[PDB]
Amino acid sequence: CGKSEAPPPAQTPEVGIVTLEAQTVTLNTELPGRTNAFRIAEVRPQVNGIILK
């Protein structure tokens, strides 16, 4: 009336294995910055006087 339930040893399954190999790949870097015009000219008067038009 007892001395039962022998525990089975585990087989340790389900290990999805990926092997590794040498592989060349290029590297990239992200850098922060701003945008600028190719050419920007602020017009400045080369004479004196008042604006008319």
Add this chain to the structure above:
Amino acid sequence: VSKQQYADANAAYLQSKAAVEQARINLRYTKVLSPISGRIGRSAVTEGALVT
């Protein structure tokens, strides 16, 4: 012609010869030359801009 007339004629000629060099150096300033050799950075000012 007297020697005095040749003297002050040559003086006025050398005076005008100095004035044309004074204009030629101002022509040389309108094409700004690199005063030394080496690397240059980016242009902080661009075309179409007024400089003084």
